[PDB]
C-alpha cells in the first residue's frame, strides 16, 4: 500500500536520524544498525512498483549502509524521504546531485499532470537497443505532460503493481491472455498497449494526454530580410513569395524548370495546377500511378519501385535524357507521407542532375515533430547535400559501387541505390499553401529553393517564370501578409501546428477507446491505408500517415456516401471536411480547431452510434437484411479504381515510350470539326467494335480534385464506369446530358498518319 | 482606483505616464532634484536619466559597476562602491548636497540589485536621501514569490515597517554600542543600519509593464511611497509632471487605466510565473543535455557575479540567497555563451537564430547572446531554441570529427580570440576640472557642459587617429556631447567627460552604427584646447572670488 | 447571381461580362489563350501591355508587331495609324499567310491619351 510506504520510509528516516546522533558522539550502535538493516530490507520488497527511490538508489544506500557511514546514508536518506513526501514519482526525472532548487520551483508550478508508464518487459532494460531505454530516449522536455519508465520482468508483477501504483496510467506488456483482463478491470482508465515500435511513444503520449480529462462534464455534456528569416525558418538556400495563390506557385515553378520537350515523372493525383503548367511548358506528361485500395476505393502514394521502373524504362529507350523533373507531392490528400530522402536518393542514382518539385501544399504540420521534419522535401535535400559531401559517404559509396559490379541496370529496380557523390547535385524545390494552416490574407503562398545550380541554370529562367503569372513584385506586399501568419501560428495557442497535432491524437485515442463509437467507426491507420510491401523505424518506412489528416472508416456504419455526410456532419461541425468517398470521409483537422470542436466531433459520431443502435434492436428480419446488404454493397463490391491508361498513340512522341503530347492533345481539341459527344451509355459499346476512345478535355471531378482524363488519354472501360457511378455535380471539363468528348475517329487517323510521317522523316 | 491599483503594486500611490519610461523617467529627476543637488547615478542608466539630471542642472555623480572581461559586460555597482562614494564626499564637505541614489535595477545584462540592503546601507550615511529606482527589466519580476522581494516598494515597505519597530531600535542601539570607537571613515568596511529616529524612506520606482494589456502604446508607470510626500515634493512633482505631459494621464486617465488595471493584473499574475518556469526548464536543459552542454553554455550567477559580491534541501537555501545576498541573476534574462564554438556572436545571430517564438534576443557581444523569454514565449520556444542549439551542436562534432589538424588549429584560433583576452572594458573618466565645481570631489556639472558645447568657435571634431596622438600629446580631450552606442543608454561619453586611452580603444574597436552623437566619418567632438583653459580660467576666478 | 451578371452586362452594353479577381494580366492573358492558338497569327500594337506579350508566348501565337507613328518633338508613341494596319494585313495576302491571323488585339487608348475609333 502505498500509505504504508510514506509512513515506513518517514520511519526509516527517524530511526536513520537517530542512528547518526548516536554514532556522531561515538559509541556502539551496532543495534540502531541492524535496526536500519531490518527496516531497509523490510522497505525492499515493496521498492519494485515506485520509481523515484525505487531499485537503484535503495541499493546505493544498502552500499553505504554496508561501508558503515551514517552521516551520508542520514543525509541522503531525509533528502529522499522529503523530496518523496511531495513530489511522489516525479522527482524520478530530477537530478538530485546538480542544482535542486531550480527542479523543485519547476515542480511546484505545476505545469500538467505527470504519468508513469509499465513497461512489462522480460528483456533486459539496460542495454541501449532495449525499448525501455530507447522509449526514455527521444522524449521532449517541452510538452507539458512528461512521464517516465517502469519496468517489471514478470506478469504478476506488472498485475500487482498497478494493482496498488496509483500514478501509472500506462502499461506496456510483452508476449498475457489474462494479465490485460486483470489491468483493465482493476482500473478502467489504464491504456494496455498490447505488445509488439517506436510509434509507442507518440501513442503513448496522446493517452497520457487525453487521461488529463479536459471535457470534465458528465451531466452536461455525456524586403531581402524577410526572404532571409523565411529562409533560415524553412530550411531553404533561397526562398520566395507569391500573393496569388498556391496554383501560381506550381505554374511559376514548373514553368521555370521545364521546356518543351522535356518529359516530366508526375503523380497523375496531383493538382490540376501542374497539369496547366505542363500544358503551358509543352513538356511531356508521364504519369505514374499511385498504389489502389480498393476497400476504401481511394489512391495512396507511389511507390518507389514504380518511379525507378519508369526511369529504367526510359533509359531502356533512350529517352531518359528528356526526363529533368519529378513531382510527387509529398503529403498525398489522403494522408501518406513520402519519405523524401530515401526517393531523392534513389532517384539521383539513375538522373543525377534531376530537378524535384515536391508539392507539400497539404504537409502544414510537417514541423509538429522533431523527426518527421526529416521527412520534409527542405531538411532532406539539406541532409542529401551533407551527406553527399562529406569523405565518408564517398568510401561507402566506393564500397557500394563496387559490390554492385556486374549487375544488369534493369536490375536496378530491386538493388537499393546510392547517389554518386562526384555527379549529383540537389536541386529540390517546394511549396507550402498558407491559409489552409497559416493565418494570412486569402490565397497567399510561398517558394522553397535548395539548387547548387540556381544562379548558373535557373535565375533568369525564375525570373521569367515570375514575370509570368504574376506580373508584379509579390516579394514586397507577401511579406507583411505572411508575417502576421507565423506570429499567429507561433504564439496563439502556443504553435497552433502542436497544439492541433496534439488534439488529433488525442481525438483519435478516444474514438479508439469509446465502445460505441468503435462499435461501427474506425480510424485507418498505416496498418491500412499503407500495405505490407511498401512498410519496410521512420528513417526506414516508405509511408507514414499524417495523424492530423483522418480517415474516418464509414464502411461497416453504412448509411452510403455523401448523404451521410451531407445530412449529419456538416450541419454543426464546420470545420473542413475536404473529400468524402464511397464509406471512408477524410476529416482534416485546421488551425481553428478547439478542444470543444473535437468534444463536439465526438458528441456528433456518438450520437450517430446511438441511433444506430437504437435502430438494430428496433430492426427487424427485413431492416437487418437489409442493412447487412447496404453495408456489404459498400465494402466488398467496390468498384476498382480508374488507373491511368496510356496516352493515345496519336498523342506519344515515341511509340516505345508511354509519355504523351498533352499540349497537343489541348489544342487539337480547339477544333469543332475534330471533336465529337458520345454519351456515356454507348461508350462501353463503342469501345467492344474496337474504337479508340480518346479524350480532348481535362475531365475533374471536383471533390477529388484530380484529372480522371486528361487530353489524348485511352479512355477505358473502368474510367466508363467510373465517371457513370459518380454524380456530382461538380465536375469540370465534363457533362453528363451532351456527352464524354472523344477525338472522332477520322481526326485521328489524320493525326496518327501525320505523327508517323514526323517521326519516320526524323529519324532519318 | 489609486488605492486598487498601488495595493496591486504595494506602493502607496501609483501614477501613470502615457508617454514611454523616459517621460516618466525625467518626471521623477525634475520632481526630487533641484539645481545643485547632487545625484548618484549608475553609469549604465537610460539616456533618459542623464537627460533628466541636465534639464534640472544636478551635478552628476557616477557609480561605475564592477567589469566582466571575460564577457565583456558590467555587472552592477558594489554597494561597497555607493559607500566609498557617500563617505569620499563627506571629506570634501559636499555630503549635504547628496539628494538622491538612482540605480537601475535588474541591469540589461541581468545582474539584479538587493534594495533593501542598499537602502538600509545608504540611509545610515543620508537619512534623508531619496531613491529612484529603474525597473524597465524588472516589472515582471513583481508577480513571481521569491523575486518579489527584490522590487524596490517591497523593499521600501519592508524598510519602513522594520524601521519603527522597538525590536529594530534595540538592534540599533547594540549596533551603536560596536560601533563606538570606529573612526566614521571605516564605515564602508563595515555594516551599517540606519537611525531609526533620523532615517526618512523615500523610493520611485519605473515601470513599463502595464502597456502590454488594456493600456496605451508605450504607456509606462511612476510608483511612489515617499514619507514626506505631501510636504516636500507633492507640488513639485504635479509641476514637472505638466512640464513633461499633460495633466490628464496623472488622474484622468488614472482612474480608467485603474479599471483596466484589474483585468491586466490578473491575467499578468497568472501568466508571468509561467515565463519564469521556462526560463528554468531551458537553463536546466541546457546543462543537462550532453550534446548542448559541450559547446554552449547558459551563464549562471556562479559567473556573473565574482565570489567577493558573494555570500556562498535547496529550496531554503534558494529563498535565504535571494532574500539576502547582493547580488543575483534573473533567471528570464539568459546570457547564452558561444565562446566554445568560436564564433563571434554578430554570426550566431545573423545565421543561426532566425526563427523565434516570442523574442528570443536583444544584444550580441562578443562571445555571447543575451536571451529574454517575455510573456510571449509558451512552451514550443524552449522546444524550437534546444531544437536548434542541438543541431548546430551535432554539426559542430561532426566538423571536429571529420576536422584535419589544420582545421582544428583554425578553429583553436577561432575560440582563442572571442575567449581570454577581450579590450578592457573602459570605466568612467574623472570629469574636466573645468566642468567639477570642486577639485576634492569628482562630480562636475554636466549641464554647463552640456550647453558650452553649442558654440561652435569652442568645439571642434577630431579623429580616432590623430585622437591617440593628441592624447599621448599631453593635450586632454573633453567630449562635448553624449556618445550612445548600441546597448541601450548606457552613454560612453557624456558632456564635460575626459575621453580616455581606455575610450579612444573602446570606440576604435566598434562596428555598430547606431552611435548617436557619434559621426565616424568626420570625427568625435571634442571642445578645443583655449575653449577649455577659458573655462577652467573662469572657474578658478570663481572660486577665488569667495575666498577674497 | 446570373442576373446581376447581365446587370453589369447592361451596364457595360457587352453579352457576357467576367469578372477575373488576379489582375488585368491574368484577365488580358486568359482571353489571349481563349482566342489564339498555337500558330495562329496576331497582330498587336508594340506598346499594348507587357502581359499580352508573355500570353502570346503561352499560347504560341505569332505575333506580327504594328507600330505606332512616333512624335519626335515631345518623345513619345500616339498609335498604329489604319492604313498600317491594312498594310500589313496585305502584305501577309501576298505570302498567303493571311487565313492564319485571329487577333488584331489593339489598345484602346494609349498610354499618353490617344484614342482609337474601333
Same mark, same amino acid.
Request: include cysteine; glycine fraction near 2%.
Given at each position: 500500500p502505498s500509505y504504508t510506504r510514506l509512513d515506513t520510509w518517514n520511519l526509516l528516516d527517524d530511526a536513520c536520524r537517530h542512528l547518526a546522533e548516536v554514532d556522531l558522539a561515538g559509541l556502539d550502535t551496532t543495534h540502531d544498525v541492524a535496526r536500519a538493516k531490518r527496516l531497509m530490507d523490510r522497505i525492499g520488497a515493496y521498492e519494485r512498483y515506485w520509481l523515484y527511490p525505487g531499485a537503484q538508489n535503495l541499493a546505493t544506500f544498502r552500499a553505504h549502509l554496508d561501508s558503515h557511514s551514517t552521516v551520508r546514508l542520514t543525509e541522503e536518506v531525509s533528502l529522499a524521504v522529503r523530496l518523496l513526501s511531495e513530489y511522489g514519482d516525479r522527482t +524520478? =526525472?530530477? *537530478? /538530485? %546531485? +546538480? %542544482? =535542486?532548487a531550480e527542479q523543485e520551483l519547476v515542480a511546484q508550478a505545476k505545469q500538467q499532470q505527470f504519468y508513469t508508464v509499465l513497461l512489462a518487459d *522480460?528483456? @533486459? +532494460?539496460? +542495454? $541501449? *537497443?532495449?525499448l525501455a531505454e530507447c522509449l526514455r530516449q527521444l522524449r521532449n522536455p517541452a510538452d507539458e505532460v512528461q512521464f517516465e519508465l517502469l519496468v517489471v520482468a514478470s506478469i504478476e508483477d506488472a498485475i500487482t503493481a498497478v494493482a496498488l501504483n496509483g500514478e501509472i496510467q500506462a502499461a506496456i506488456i510483452r508476449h498475457w491472455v489474462e494479465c490485460a483482463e486483470w489491468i483493465r478491470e482493476l482500473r478502467p482508465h489504464i491504456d494496455l498497449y498490447l505488445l509488439t515500435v517506436t510509434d509507442l511513444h507518440s501513442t503513448v503520449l496522446a493517452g497520457l494526454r487525453n487521461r488529463y480529462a479536459t471535457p470534465f462534464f458528465d451531466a452536461l455534456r455525456a524586403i531581402k530580410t524577410a526572404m532571409d528569416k523565411a529562409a533560415v525558418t524553412w530550411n531553404a538556400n533561397q526562398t520566395y513569395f507569391v500573393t496569388n495563390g498556391t496554383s501560381t506557385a506550381n505554374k511559376i515553378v514548373v514553368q521555370a524548370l521545364t521546356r518543351p520537350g522535356d518529359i516530366v515523372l508526375i *503523380?497523375?493525383?496531383?493538382?490540376?495546377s501542374h497539369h496547366y503548367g505542363l500544358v503551358l511548358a509543352g513538356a511531356y506528361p508521364m504519369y505514374l500511378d499511385a498504389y489502389p485500395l480498393p476497400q476504401y476505393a481511394i489512391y495512396g502514394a507511389v511507390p518507389l519501385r514504380t518511379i525507378k521502373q519508369a526511369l529504367l524504362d526510359l533509359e531502356a529507350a533512350g529517352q531518359l535524357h528528356r526526363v529533368r523533373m519529378l513531382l510527387l507531392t509529398n503529403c498525398t490528400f489522403d494522408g501518406v507521407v513520402y519519405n523524401p530522402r530515401r526517393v531523392m536518393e534513389e532517384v539521383l542514382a539513375i538522373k543525377p542532375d534531376i530537378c524535384f518539385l515536391w508539392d507539400e501544399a497539404w504537409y502544414a504540420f510537417a514541423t509538429a515533430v522533431p523527426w518527421a521534419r526529416q521527412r520534409t522535401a527542405m531538411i532532406a535535400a539539406e541532409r542529401l547535400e551533407q551527406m553527399l559531401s562529406t569523405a565518408e559517404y564517398a568510401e561507402e559509396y566506393r564500397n557500394w559501387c563496387a559490390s554492385m559490379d556486374g549487375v544488369d541496370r534493369s536490375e536496378w529496380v530491386d538493388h537499393r541505390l546510392l547517389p554518386d557523390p562526384n555527379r549529383a547535385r540537389v536541386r529540390v524545390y517546394a511549396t507550402h499553401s498558407t491559409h489552409k494552416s497559416l493565418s494570412a490574407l486569402r490565397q497567399a503562398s510561398m517558394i522553397h529553393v535548395r539548387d547548387q545550380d540556381f544562379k548558373a541554370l535557373t535565375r533568369d529562367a525564375f525570373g521569367e517564370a515570375f514575370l509570368t503569372? /504574376?506580373? /508584379? %513584385?509579390p516579394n514586397q506586399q507577401l511579406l507583411a501578409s505572411l508575417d502576421l501568419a507565423r506570429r499567429q501560428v507561433d504564439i496563439e495557442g502556443f504553435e497552433l501546428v502542436r497544439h492541433v497535432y496534439n488534439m488529433a491524437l488525442v481525438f483519435r485515442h478516444r474514438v479508439r477507446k469509446d465502445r460505441l463509437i468503435s462499435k461501427w467507426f474506425r480510424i485507418l491507420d498505416e496498418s491500412d491505408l499503407v500495405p505490407d510491401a511498401f512498410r519496410s523505424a521512420w528513417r526506414s518506412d516508405q509511408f507514414v500517415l499524417d495523424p492530423t489528416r483522418l480517415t474516418l472508416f464509414i464502411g461497416a456504419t453504412g448509411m452510403n456516401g455523401y448523404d451521410f455526410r451531407e445530412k449529419i456532419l456538416m450541419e454543426r461541425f464546420g470545420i473542413q471536411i475536404n473529400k468524402t468517398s464511397i464509406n471512408s470521409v477524410l476529416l482534416i483537422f485546421t488551425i481553428g480547431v478547439t478542444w470543444s470542436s473535437v468534444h463536439y466531433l465526438l458528441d456528433v459520431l456518438r450520437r450517430v452510434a446511438i441511433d444506430l443502435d437504437r435502430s438494430q434492436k428496433a430492426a427487424s428480419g427485413a431492416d437487418l437484411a437489409l442493412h447487412r446488404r447496404h453495408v456489404e454493397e459498400i465494402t466488398q463490391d467496390l468498384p476498382h479504381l480508374p488507373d491511368f491508361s496510356e496516352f493515345d498513340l496519336a498523342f506519344r512522341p515515341d511509340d516505345a515510350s508511354s509519355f504523351g503530347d498533352m499540349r497537343s492533345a489541348f489544342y487539337a481539341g480547339y477544333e469543332e470539326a475534330d471533336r465529337e459527344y458520345v454519351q456515356i451509355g454507348l461508350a462501353g459499346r463503342r469501345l467492344a467494335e474496337g474504337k479508340t476512345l480518346v479524350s480532348t /478535355?481535362? &475531365? &475533374? $471531378?471536383? $471533390? @477529388?480534385?484530380? @484529372?480522371v482524363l486528361v487530353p489524348g488519354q485511352l479512355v477505358s472501360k473502368e474510367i466508363i464506369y467510373f465517371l457513370a457511378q459518380l454524380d456530382v455535380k461538380e465536375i469540370h471539363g465534363y457533362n453528363p446530358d451532351l456527352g464524354l468528348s472523344v477525338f472522332t475517329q477520322a481526326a485521328l487517323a489524320r493525326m496518327e498518319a501525320a505523327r508517323n510521317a514526323v517521326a519516320t522523316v526524323g529519324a532519318a
Open positions: +524520478a =526525472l530530477f *537530478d /538530485t %546531485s +546538480a %542544482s =535542486l *522480460d528483456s @533486459p +532494460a539496460t +542495454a $541501449p *537497443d532495449s *503523380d497523375r493525383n496531383c493538382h490540376k503569372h /504574376t506580373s /508584379t %513584385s /478535355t481535362f &475531365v &475533374v $471531378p471536383y $471533390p @477529388p480534385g484530380f @484529372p
